[PDB]
Every structure is written in structure tokens, then in C-alpha cells.
């Protein structure tokens, strides 16, 4: 009676969750934009009415792809650069005591060593100023990386400044964006759009503080794969950035040493003037109000009358125990002890100063046997950034105590990329469909 | 009421629109299905998109629906696949809902369409012989 027959429809708007390789689009840098398609001046966003999709920031393959691409670009930016194999020599080091502060005693080592020249049968006695973290005593010292692997000097002209990158899908694939404010990264998103690709995401490498990132539109956002599991990192996104001013005030001097044919090693000659610790400044009132907002948002998950305590990092490598980042070529590791130090009970122009240590021997990603040497930067360096989020970890959390402890965390840059790709997913279009209709061939 | 013609909703704007309303924008989705280490992944992605498009086109051709966006077939609709009438399909559902419902009755229909197209080709060859 029905008299129904199969009918094939092509171009149906149906998609399935899929994993594919996205490509870079952008408007000397480590993040190579010369191999990226130009970004369209007028990107098109199609707002899908009535479409409710499923999103999960913690299983997004986009984060893994971004991590892999960033690591690949970092590796490729270092291939055509000098390998400092000859630098692994015995170093005769003395203390730098000329115009140093009480907090810089023993932090800089004036190390003299023999070095190769452009002629294979000649040697030159040179000297350089190394950092205490970069050398280990064997008055005789050696570079920290010597017993692990040789370090590749970063090419001086290549710039470390993050550049925005757009990740766009191939033909037949669509990037779905969740426009729902207050969205916590997991679950059903009712307000959805299709975009050729995302906003420009800057690959900022940082620990314990998300820098130069996107801000929440409505309020501070707390996100976790499993909030009740203390082993899962908590991503906090701010709605108002906190200005942080980080400076190395030493007037560094760079000198070139010819270590071979067409091979130059950039040493730190002599600091011009007083030697004092690099540091960072954060507004006290702004940080206090931001922590109050974070406490308010955390009370929604951990009870209305719980005590919220911010404490120091538990321990581990210098990368994770300190706010590690790069500011104008130099690699800062800042002791964020004045920030996460407070207790909150349910009920001026001064600023917090975070001391920082500079490092030249860098293991940017969590790898062993692949190290990079940062050439010294000429002159004082000062830079200003927005703290837009935090990577926290809950300490224990047994039923014995009603107090919740949160400590800074990080190390894995996948969390940093997840904070920007949380509202994005990739799907593959299934244009073919079959339906019943009265029509017959 | 009065009207001022049709409108354009975008690449997947009709995803939330009903199946009858979503069938009005087939060409919009159809048009966009085609368009030293990173020169390989890009080429792999382009090749994969080409293969998927050609697989879809080959299926449509071997079903006798070459060059058609809406194609009637001679295969009857077995009631086991779906017992819903037209009133609650084309005006009260989306193509995504139909896909989630019918995704487990797909390959059998494809094989039936292929065999039916082959039978039609043989029958047409026999008819033209007279």
C-alpha cells in the first residue's frame, strides 16, 4: 500500500566525527609561515541554526596535530644552524663578583676555555659568561648537556615571537565551532557554526600561566576532564587579563667566536654596568581580584563553604616548578611563589615581584637527548604579557579535610593548545544518503 | 504571507533544516567536496579528498544515478529498514537523524542498487537488440 522505493540523495548535510590532517594558514621565524597558504581577508562563518553537536576538548585530535606540527616546526627551524659539538670542553670558571647584587652571587660564571678555530691546527683561548644552571662542576666545569647530547645553537636571526596560525581542513571536511558562552569544553553545544578555520592561535610556550591567549567572554571558566579526579589538570580561563611585566635588566654583550669554517658561537662578553636579577611584576590588586573570581568559580564545583588554598608547586624539574617562558629570545624561569600563596574562607599601586632565572641550554619539549642553546641577546630586555589563564592541580582531596589545595602545574604543552582549541572540532561530510519515496525509476 | 524569494544559508546551513527543506540545497554541499615534509601531508590530504569524491561518484554511477542529485531507483524499500511514513520523515526530521537511524542498513541497499543497475543495463541491451 505504501509503495515506497529507494531514492539516493547527493549533497546531504550530514557529517561524522573524523580525524584528518589540517593545514596552516597565516596572514625569519621559528613558526614557518612561508609554507602556509595566505589567510582569506574575509573568512566565512556559517551559523548552523537548530544544530546541536557533541564536543569534547580532552579527546580533540586537533590538539595532538598542533603539538606534532609545532614540534616539527621547532625541529626544522634548527636544522640549518651551528651544532656546538666543540663547546663540550673543560671550562675554567671563576665567580662574577663585579657589581652584583646579593641575589646574583654565584649565578654567573666567567669561564675561560680553549676552542677550535677556522684552521684545524690552531686553538684559541676564549672566555664567556655562563649561567649557574648551564654548567656543572667536574674550578673545572662542563656544560650541563655534555653527558647527554650535543646542543644546536639557535640561529640568531630566527625570531621566537609567536605568530598566529589557522588550522584549516581539506575538501570534504568541516571545522565545527561552538559559539556557546559558558561552555566548559565537554557535552552538547547547541549554538554551532562551520568555519573554514579558527581564529589566529599563537603557539605560546609557557608553564603555570597561559600567556597571550583568548579570554572568556562572560566569566572565569573552569575546565577539567574529570574535576573529581585530582590527577587531571584544571584549565582556568580568565575573562580579564592580568598584565605581567617581565624584564632582564642586564646590559648583555654578545661576541662572535669563529669556531670553524662558517661556524660562529655567540658568547656573553661582559655585562655593561650593574648586574641584578631578572624578574617579573604582577599587579597585586588585579591578581587578588582574579584569584577571588577563580575561588568563586571553584566553589561551584568544590562546595559553597569549602576553604580554597593556593600554595606552591609540589616539585620536579625547573620547567614545571617555575613559570617557564621565553621573552625576547631569553628563556625565563620565574618563581611564582608570591602568586599562589593564600587562603580563602567562605563568607594599591604596589605589585608582586617574582624573581626569575635566565637559561640558555633549553629542552623546550619533554625530550631527552635534544637540547638547544639560546644565543645571548644584546642589551636590556623588557616585555609585557597578558595572563589569560592558569594550569592548576588539586592536592589530594580526601574526605578527612574540607580544605581544597590547588598548586600551579604544566610542562605538557598539549594543555596550552587545548585551551585554544577547546571550542573546535573536525568532522567529515557524508553527502550520500538513501530515503524512501513514492517515486520509481 | 508575502515573500521576496529564496535565501542562501551557506555550506551546511540547511543541516538543521528538515529533510525536505534540506534537499533544496544539495548543490551547495556538493560544490565544496573538492575544494619538504609538509608538501607530503598536504598532497596526501588532497589525494584522500579526491579518492573519497571519486568513491562517491563511482557509487552513484554504478547505481545508475550518474550526474543526478536526486535519483529514483527500482529497488523497493524493505519495511525492515524503516517503518516510518513520509509524514514523519521529510517534515519532522533532519538528515542527521535519518543517518543515525539508517547507518546500520546501508551496505545492503548499496549492493541491491548495484545488482539492480546491472540488471537494468542487461535488460536495456536486450531491448535495443530488437
Amino acid at each position, epitope marked *: 500500500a505504501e509503495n515506497l522505493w529507494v531514492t539516493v540523495y547527493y549533497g546531504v548535510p550530514v557529517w561524522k566525527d573524523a580525524e584528518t590532517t589540517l593545514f596552516c594558514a597565516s596572514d625569519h621565524n621559528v613558526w614557518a609561515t612561508h609554507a602556509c597558504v595566505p589567510t582569506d581577508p574575509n573568512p566565512q562563518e556559517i551559523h548552523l541554526e537548530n544544530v546541536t553537536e557533541e564536543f569534547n576538548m580532552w579527546k580533540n585530535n586537533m590538539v595532538e596535530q598542533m603539538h606534532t606540527d609545532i614540534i616539527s616546526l621547532w625541529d626544522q627551524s634548527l636544522k640549518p644552524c651551528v651544532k656546538l659539538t666543540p663547546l663540550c670542553v673543560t671550562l675554567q670558571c671563576t665567580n662574577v663578583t663585579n657589581n652584583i647584587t646579593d641575589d646574583m652571587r654565584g649565578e654567573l660564571k666567567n669561564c675561560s676555555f680553549n676552542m677550535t678555530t677556522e684552521l684545524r691546527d690552531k686553538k684559541q683561548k676564549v672566555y664567556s659568561l655562563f649561567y649557574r644552571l648551564d654548567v656543572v662542576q667536574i674550578k673545572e666545569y662542563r656544560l650541563i648537556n655534555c653527558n647527554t647530547s650535543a646542543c644546536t645553537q639557535a640561529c640568531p636571526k630566527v625570531s621566537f615571537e609567536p605568530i598566529p596560525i589557522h588550522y584549516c581542513a581539506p575538501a570534504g571536511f568541516a571545522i565545527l565551532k561552538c559559539k556557546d558562552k559558558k561552555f566548559n569544553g565537554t557535552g552538547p553545544c547547541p549554538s554551532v557554526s562551520t568555519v573554514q578555520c579558527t581564529h589566529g592561535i599563537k603557539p605560546v610556550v609557557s608553564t603555570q600561566l597561559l600567556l597571550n591567549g583568548s579570554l572568556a567572554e562572560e566569566e572565569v571558566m573552569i575546565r577539567s576532564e574529570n574535576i573529581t579526579n585530582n590527577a587531571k589538570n584544571i584549565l582556568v580561563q580568565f575573562n580579564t587579563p592580568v598584565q605581567i611585566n617581565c624584564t632582564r635588566p642586564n646590559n648583555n654583550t654578545r661576541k662572535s667566536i669563529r669556531i670553524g669554517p662558517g661556524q660562529a658561537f655567540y658568547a656573553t662578553g661582559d655585562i655593561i654596568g650593574d648586574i641584578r636579577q631578572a624578574h617579573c611584576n604582577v599587579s597585586k590588586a588585579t591578581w587578588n581580584e582574579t584569584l577571588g573570581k577563580v575561588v568563586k568559580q571553584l566553589r561551584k564545583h568544590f562546595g559553597n563553604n569549602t576553604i580554597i588554598r593556593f600554595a606552591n608547586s609540589s616539585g620536579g624539574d625547573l620547567e614545571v616548578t617555575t613559570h617557564s617562558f621565553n621573552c625576547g629570545g631569553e628563556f625565563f624561569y620565574c618563581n611564582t611563589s608570591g602568586l599562589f600563596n593564600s587562603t580563602w574562607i567562605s563568607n594599591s599601586n604596589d605589585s608582586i615581584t617574582l624573581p626569575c632565572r635566565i637559561k640558555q641550554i633549553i629542552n623546550m619539549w619533554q625530550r631527552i637527548g635534544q637540547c638547544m642553546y639560546a644565543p645571548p641577546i644584546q642589551g636590556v630586555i623588557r616585555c609585557v604579557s597578558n595572563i589569560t589563564g592558569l594550569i592548576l592541580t588539586r592536592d589530594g582531596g580526601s574526605t578527612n579535610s574540607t580544605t581544597e589545595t590547588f598548586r600551579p602545574g604544566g610542562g605538557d604543552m598539549r594543555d596550552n593548545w587545548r585551551s585554544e582549541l577547546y571550542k573546535y572540532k573536525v568532522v567529515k561530510i557524508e553527502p550520500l544518503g538513501v530515503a524512501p519515496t513514492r517515486c520509481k525509476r | *504571507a508575502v515573500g521576496i*524569494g529564496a*535565501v*542562501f*544559508l551557506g555550506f551546511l546551513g540547511a543541516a538543521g533544516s528538515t529533510m525536505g527543506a534540506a534537499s533544496m540545497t544539495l548543490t551547495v554541499q556538493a560544490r565544496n567536496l573538492l575544494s619538504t615534509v609538509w608538501g607530503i601531508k598536504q598532497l596526501q590530504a588532497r589525494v584522500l579528498a579526491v579518492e573519497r569524491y571519486l568513491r562517491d561518484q563511482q557509487l552513484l554511477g554504478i547505481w545508475g544515478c550518474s550526474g543526478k542529485l536526486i535519483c529514483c531507483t527500482n529497488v523497493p524499500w524493505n519495511s525492515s529498514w524503516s517503518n516510518r511514513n513520509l509524514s514523519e520523515i521529510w517534515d519532522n526530521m533532519t538528515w542527521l537523524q535519518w543517518d543515525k537511524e539508517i547507518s546500520n542498513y546501508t551496505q545492503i541497499i548499496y549492493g541491491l542498487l548495484e545488482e539492480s543497475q546491472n540488471q537494468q543495463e542487461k535488460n536495456e541491451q536486450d531491448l535495443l537488440a530488437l
Partner: antibody
Amino acid sequence: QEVLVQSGAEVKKPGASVKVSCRAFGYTFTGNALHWVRQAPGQGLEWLGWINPHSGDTTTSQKFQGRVYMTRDKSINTAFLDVTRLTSDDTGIYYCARDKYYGNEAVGMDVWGQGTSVTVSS
Amino acid sequence: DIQLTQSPSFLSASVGDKVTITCRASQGVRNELAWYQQKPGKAPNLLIYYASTLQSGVPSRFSATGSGTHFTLTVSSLQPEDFATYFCQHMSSYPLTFGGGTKVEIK
């Protein structure tokens, strides 16, 4: 998330021409018919006309024919309303509104712009 | 042009009462009427479309009935935010026109 933003207030002399812009965010600009309406101070609303942002087709009230024109730019998602030969009766608040436009016909004016005040006086 | 007459022109009622506004059309309008609410110094908002369907995000107290030439907008329980101007607008034939306007004020 659907919002319509128009140009600022305008003051003009009689017999001049005025342009009113209306840009859209939060939805596909070519997906809904756009109405242009006016309201005089202390009076009711009066429907100037409407336009199809996709095909560019326009329909104007018969009393306004030959005096008010409508255009749209898709590259930057805006509708322009040109009102020429203004008089002291044309003073008021002009609004651009998105239509629900179900079934490709007028249904309701769900999203409204914040409006622009046009003042005509010697 | 089609004339839409709205009654009462002015109305005073207290919170918790019931208010009915009648919009009458000179010609026939099957279901192509919309009810709009406008406040001082603000653009109107869509209360009802199709003369019987409540706009999404509107409180359930609002309701509409009637087809053809007679239409009625009913607010069962008034609230302090419901005291403002109400319009009825038809779209069956050109030119579209709005109602004269009914202003509701707290007593």
C-alpha cells in the same frame, strides 16, 4: 548572538540625501530577508520596505516608490538605505530588522537593530 | 493599505491581573500576524509570530488567539516588566502595517 548595528545619528537639511547602514553579526547575512522600518517621535511604527540580501530583490511601500532605495553588500554584510528628498515628516528613528523568514515568506521581526535617529529641519 | 485597529488605546491595570488587547484588521489575515512589545527608547521585541506561536525566550504568560480579522493577545499575570507599548502587525499583503498601539501602565 544575532545583532544588527547601524550607523550613528544624522541631521540633514530638507532636500538632501541620507544613507543608513546596517551590519549584521551572529547569523548568515544572506539567510533572512531584511526589513527597514521607521518610527516618528511619539507615533507608531511605519514599514518602509524590505530587501532580499541574497538576490538583492527589494520591495518598497507604494507611497515611497521612487524616493527610497535599498542596496546590500555581501563582502562586508551590510544593507544600505538611501532616503532622498527628506522633509520634516521624515524625522524619526530608523530600524533594520531581520525576519524569521520561514518558508521564504514574512513571519516576524525577531532581531532588531538599536536604531538610528534621523533629524530633518531647516 | 490595510488598516489595523488596536484596542484599548490606553489601559491601566495592576500586577497579577489579566490584560487582553484586541487587534482588528480591515481585510482578511489568515494567520500572518505578529505581536510586538516596545519600551521607551528601545527597539521592539517579537512576542508572537503566526498569531498563535510564542517566540523563543518569551515568558509563557503571553498567549495569542484568533484568525482572519480578529486577534487577541492575552497576558494572564502581569509583571512590572510587562508595562510597555504593544503593537500588532500584518504581513499578508503589501504594504506591511503596524497597529495604532496599546500602552499598558501600572495602576
